[PDB]
Amino acid sequence: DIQWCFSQVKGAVDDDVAEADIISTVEFNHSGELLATGDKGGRVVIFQQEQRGEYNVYSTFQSHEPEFDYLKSLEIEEKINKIRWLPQKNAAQFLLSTNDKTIKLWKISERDKRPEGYNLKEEDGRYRDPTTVTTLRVPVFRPMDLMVEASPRRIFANAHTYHINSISINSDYETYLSADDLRINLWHLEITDRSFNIVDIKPANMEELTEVITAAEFHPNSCNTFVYSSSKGTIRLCDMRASALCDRHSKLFEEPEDPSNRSFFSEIISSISDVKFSHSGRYMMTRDYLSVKIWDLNMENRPVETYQVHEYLRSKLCSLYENDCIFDKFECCWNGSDSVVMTGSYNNFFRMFDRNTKRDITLEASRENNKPRTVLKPRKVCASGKRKKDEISVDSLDFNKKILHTAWHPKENIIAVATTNNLYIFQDKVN
Amino acid sequence: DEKVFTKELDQWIEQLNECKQLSESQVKSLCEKAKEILTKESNVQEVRCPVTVCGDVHGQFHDLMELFRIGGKSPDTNYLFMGDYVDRGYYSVETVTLLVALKVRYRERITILRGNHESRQITQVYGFYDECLRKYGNANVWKYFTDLFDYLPLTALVDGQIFCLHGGLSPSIDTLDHIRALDRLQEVPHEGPMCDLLWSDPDDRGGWGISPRGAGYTFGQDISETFNHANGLTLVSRAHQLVMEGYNWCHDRNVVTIFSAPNYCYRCGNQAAIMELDDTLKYSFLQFDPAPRRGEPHVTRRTPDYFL
Amino acid sequence: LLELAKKKLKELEEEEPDPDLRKKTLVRNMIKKLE
Amino acid sequence: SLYPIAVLIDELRNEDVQLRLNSIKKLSTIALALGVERTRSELLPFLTDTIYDEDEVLLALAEQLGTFTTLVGGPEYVHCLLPPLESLATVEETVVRDKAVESLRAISHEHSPSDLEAHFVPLVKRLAGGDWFTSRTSACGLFSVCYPRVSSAVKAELRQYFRNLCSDDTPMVRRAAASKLGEFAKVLELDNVKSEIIPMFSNLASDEQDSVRLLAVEACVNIAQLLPQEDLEALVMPTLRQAAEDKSWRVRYMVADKFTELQKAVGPEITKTDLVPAFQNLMKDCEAEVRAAASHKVKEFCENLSADCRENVIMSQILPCIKELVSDANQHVKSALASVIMGLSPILGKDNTIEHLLPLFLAQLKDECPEVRLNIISNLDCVNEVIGIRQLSQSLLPAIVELAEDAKWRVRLAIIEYMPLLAGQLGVEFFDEKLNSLCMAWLVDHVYAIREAATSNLKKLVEKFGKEWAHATIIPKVLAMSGDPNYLHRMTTLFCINVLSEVCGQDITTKHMLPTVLRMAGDPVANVRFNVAKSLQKIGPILDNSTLQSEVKPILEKLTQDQDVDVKYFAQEALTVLSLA
C-alpha cells in the first residue's frame, strides 16, 4: 500500500464559507500539469504544477454569470457542473465547462510581448500636434512579464430543455456529447448553432415517467461507443455504426436483481451516479449510493467485482431519508494503470480499494491533525457499541462533510480530494 | 414636400425587406411622427370595416410575415392588432419598428392597440429591456417605445357594432364614456377599472371569480350580455389567452378568442386564427400552423452535413 | 421503513419550479410502487 | 501629406475590433507609402507574431499577406513573407489555417527553383515535423505545390515525409493526409504512384477510425482515375469492394454518394461486371440515408450503363429493387425515388414503359404523403415525350384534381407553380372541357398567395393561348366575378384585368372590360377606389387621349376629392403618370 502523505491545502480556514466557495468539480489534464477546480458561482481556478513540485495558482476567471430565463422566466443558475479539458493544439490549452444550460469553450494562454512605439501620441497617450510628424515609425515589440489570460471562443447554447449533467470529448478530436436529463446531443467543436439529437427516452406524455439519464461517457479508443447510464440501475452501451439513430441498445448491462436484500428503498439506493470507463477501454466502473461495481465489456448479465463503500449505513438508511442525505451524487475515479480505484464517502473519509490484492483502506482528509510530509493512517469506523480509542461510533460521523469530487493524476501518484471548502492534494512519499 | 419623405420611407421599407439594422435618428423621427399622430386620437380608435383582425403576436417576426403573405400585402388589405407585441418573444424590436413604419406610411389604413403586457414593469422584466440592451446597449429606445405605448388607444369600436379590446372587461365599466374618461398618459396601474379591463379574462366558471394572475378579475356572462343589450352589441372579440385550437366559442358564442401567435412561448404548438370582419360583419377564420422557420430547427433527428 | 406514508410529506409539500426530475421521479415512483 | 497614413499605421494598435480590422485591410496603402527597403524590416517583423485572436482580424491579415508579392521588393525577395505566414498556419482556428495555407500556395509560384529548395522546402519539412498537431495539419497541404519543381533527392525526401504523415497519431493529421492523398498523387510518377501511394491508400482505407475510412473513398476515386485500366482489378478494386460492405454507415453512404463518378472511373466493363451487385446491396441496405442516397443516383447510373445490354440489365437486375423501394416506409427514400424515376422511361422504348413503369407511377401519385405527388408531377415531361401523356391523361386527371385541393396551401402553392407546364403539355379542348372548372375556383381561393399564383398562371396561359381563347373563355367569368361581397374577390378581378389587358388588347379591354372598371371606381370601400386608380395608372401607358380625356380624367378628378388620403394620393400619382410633368 502506497502510504499517502499530506502535501498541500487550498481555500480558507473559517467554516462560514458563502455559497460561492463550495468546490463543484476537480479535473486534471491530459499531460498532468494543470488542475481546474470550478466552484459554484463559476470561478474556475486553474492550478499549475510547479516544474515533485507543489501546485501554485495559474489563472482565474469567472466562467459563468447569473443569467435569467425569458419564457419560463426561471432563475437559470451559474454552478459549474463539469470541466473537461481538450488535448494540446498549441501553446494554449482549452477546456469546456457547463452550467445547467450552456457550454463554453475557454482558452488559457500566456503572453510576454507588448507593442512599444507611437506616432501621434506620447508614451502616456498625450497626443501631439497633427501635422508636425515627419517620419512615420512602426511599433516595435519588447518583453514584459507573463500575463496569463482566459477568454471564451465559442458558446454552445439553447439546446437543452432540461438540466445538463455530462459532457465527453469523442476519441477523434472533433465532436463531443452533452446529456441532459432525457436526451443526448452530439455537438461539433466548431459549429455553435446546430446539434444532432442522438438519443431520446422521453415518453409521449410526461406523467408516466419511469427513468432518466444520470451519466454519459464515450470510449477512450473507439469513436462510436457511448455508455449513457440510467436512473434505474441499467447501463446501455450504444453504438453509432449500425444505425444513424442509436436509440436501440447494442447491449444492456443490468444486474439480475438480488431478491435477498430487497428492502423499502430498493430502488433509491440502486440508481447509478457516475459511470467511468477504465483508461484502456475494457472495464466501466459505476458508483451507486452504496457500492462501486466494476462491469466488464464482454459479459453483460453480471459484474465481475463489487466493493461495498460504507456498508455501516444500510441500517441508518431509514434516518437518512428525512435530511435529504440519501440523494447524493458521489463520484469515482480510476488509477493510472487500472489497479486501484477511489471513491468519496461521508465525514471526510475517502475509501480507496485495490483490485489486484483485494485490500482496502480508509484515509481521512482533515486539517487539525496533519502536517506536510507526514503519513495518513487508516481510520477505521466501528458499527457496534464496542469502541476503543481508534474507531468512531457511527453515531458520531458528521453527515455534512461529503467528499463528492475527486481526481487522480494520469501517470504519477498524486491525487486531489475536494471537500466542501478545500482542495487537499495528498501525494505519496517519493523515496 | 411629402413626396421625398414617402420615397425615403419606401426605400427604408425595401431595406427592411433586406433585413438591415437601423440607426437612432430614424427611430427617433418615426417615434416623433407617431406621437404627433397619436396625441390627437382618443382611447377608442375608430376602425372602419372591412378589416382583418389579429390578436397577440408577442414579437414573433416570422409568424407576422407569414400573416402578411396569407392576408395580402398592405395597403391592399387593411389590418388591425390587439396588443401583446412584447414579452415571451425574441424579435420584439423588429415587430414594433415595422408596425410603426407601416403605420406612418399608411396612417389611416392600419390600426394598433395596447395590451396588458405594455406596462413599464412588465416590459422591463420580460425580455424587451434585455432585447434593447442587446440591440442598442442603452435604455433610450425603451423610454421612446414606452412613451409611444402610453398614447396607444385602449379599445377599438368597429363601425359602431363590434367592440374589440385586448385584456377583458371590468365590473365598473358599463359604457364607453368610462374608457374615454381615462387618461391614457399613465403607467399601467395595479388596481382600478382600467387594470381589470386590460388584465381580466373570461370565466367559464359560473359567476364572478378571483383572477389567478393576481391583477384584474374574471367577468361573468351576465355582465357581458347586459353590456351587449345596453349598447346593442352582438359579439365581443378578445385575445391574450392561449388556446390550443387557435380560437374557441365560449359564453354562448358571445366571446371569440383570437390568437395570432402559433406556438406561444414556442412550446404549446397551437393553431392561430384571424377573425376577418367581412364587409357584412360575418366572421371568417384562416388558420395557419407555426410558420416554417428558415434553416430550422437546429436540433433535428436528421444527420447534419459534418456527420454525413 | 413501512411507515413511509408520513415521510411522503417531502414530495407532498414541494413546489418544484422544474428542478431536475431525478429526485422528483424517485419519490414519485417510490410511493406508487406500494400505495 | 502623410497624416492619414500616420493615423492608419497606429490604428492597428488600438482596442476597437473594427478599427484594427480596417487598418489591416488598408495595410496596402501603408506598405506602399513606407517604401520597399523599409517594409521588409519594419512592417513584416511587426506582423510576425501578433496577439490578435479575433477570427476576423487574423483572417484578413492572412488574406492581405497573400497579395504582397510586389510591395516586398519583387519575385526576388518573396521569401520574406514566410515568417509571418508560418505563424498563422499554426493557429488554433481552422478557417484561418486554411486561408494561410491557400496564401502560401499562391505565393509559392513566385519563388525560383534554387530559392525554392533553399527557403520553401525547409518550411514544409519543418511544419511537417513540428510538435503541435496543427503545424502538421497545415503542412499536409503544401506538397502538391513544391513537388514538381524540386530535384530528385528533395522529391524522395518529400515522399518520405508524406508517408510519415499518413501514419500519424492524432486522427486530425491522418484526416488531412487522406484529404490531400489524391491531390498529391496527381503529380507523382506513374510507377512511383503504383509502388508508393497504393500502400498508403490501403493503410488509410483500413483505418481504425471512420472519419478517415470515409475520405478513403474519394482518394480511391482519384487514384482510379489516375491509373490505367489493366491494374484496377489488382490495386484499387479490392479496397472499393471492402468499402461497399463496410460496418459504419457513413462509409457506405459516402460510397453511395460517389457512385456515378466511381462508374465513370472504373469503366464500363468493370462497372457491369462488379458494381451492379454493390448497387443492389446499397439499395437494400438497412439504414435510411444509405437508401436515399443510393436512390438519388438511380437515373444517372442507369443512363451511363453499356449500350450493349442496357435494357436487359436494367430489366433483369435493377427494376425489382425500384419496385420494392416504391413502397418503402421512409419518406426521404420515396421522395428521392419519385423525383428521378422519370429518367428510366426513355431507356426502354415506351413498350416496357407501359408494361411495368405505369403501375409504379399510379402508386406514387396515389401516395398520401405530400411532395411525392409534387415531384412525380413536376417531371411528367419524360413520359409525355415518350408515351404521349394523352394516353395517360385518364390517370393523370384524378391525381391532379385530388392534389389541387388540400388543407395546407403550401402543397396548393407548389402544385399551382407546377400547373403551367402541365397546362401547356396537355392540350386546348381537353383543358377547357375539364380543368376550366378548377381554374375558376383557384381565383376565389382563400389564401392570397394562391390568388397571386392563379392570376400569374392565367397570365401565362393567355400568353401561351393568346387572345382568342381567353376572349372565348375567361372574359365573361372574370367580368361577372365583380359582384362578390368580400372586397378581396373584387380586387382579384382588378389584378386579373391589370394582368390580362396587355394580352387581350385595347380593342376589347376598353370596349367591354374598361366600363366595368370605371363602374368599380365608385365602390363604397376606399380599398377599391385606390385599387381602381392604380389600375387606371397601369393601363394609361397603353391608353391615348381620345378615351383618356373622355372618361379617365373625370374619374381621377372625382377621386381626388375623396375623404380618404390614399385615394387622393394615388389619383394624383396617376395624373402625373400621364407623362405630363
Author numbering:
A (entry chain B): 9 to 59, 68 to 447
B (entry chain C): 2 to 309
C (entry chain D): 1 to 35
D (entry chain A): 9 to 589
Question: What do the study authors state?
Answer:
PP2A is a major S/T phosphatase in the cell and is generally assembled as a trimeric enzyme composed of a 65 kD structural subunit (A), a 36 kD catalytic subunit (C), and a regulatory subunit (B) of varying sizes. The A and C subunits interact to form the dimeric core enzyme, which only gains its full activity, subcellular localization, and substrate specificity after interacting with one of the many regulatory B subunits to form the trimeric holoenzyme. Instead, PP2A depends on its B subunit to recognize and bind to specific sequence motifs that are often distal from the phosphosite but help to position the phosphosite in the active site of the catalytic C subunit of the PP2A heterotrimer. We have previously shown that Eya3 recruits PP2A–B55α to dephosphorylate pT58 on Myc, increasing Myc stability and enhancing primary tumor growth of triple-negative breast cancer (TNBC).
Kruse et al. have used protein engineering to design peptides that bind the proposed substrate binding surface of B55 and identified one of the peptides, B55i, as a strong binder of PP2A–B55α that inhibits its interaction with substrates. We next incubated the PP2A–B55 complex purified from HEK293 FreeStyle cells with the B55i peptide and determined its cryo-EM structure to an overall resolution of 3.5 Å. The C-terminal tail of the C subunit is clearly visible, and its conformation and interactions are similar to that in the PP2A–B55 + Eya3 complex. The structure also shows that B55i forms a helix–turn–helix structure, as predicted by Kruse et al.. Density for the C-terminal helix of B55i (residues 21–32) is well defined, but the density for the N-terminal helix is much weaker. Although the main chain of the N-terminal helix can be modeled, the side-chain conformations are less defined (other than K10), and the density for the connecting loop between the N- and C-terminal helices is even weaker. B55i binds to a similar surface as the Eya3 peptide, mostly contacting blades 3 and 4 of the β-propeller and the α1 and α2 helices positioned above blade 5 on the B55 surface. In particular, K10B55i forms a salt bridge with D340B55 and a hydrogen bond with the carbonyl oxygen of Y337B55. Residue K23B55i forms a hydrogen bond with D340B55, and its aliphatic chain forms hydrophobic interactions with F343B55. Residue R28B55i forms a hydrogen bond with E223B55.
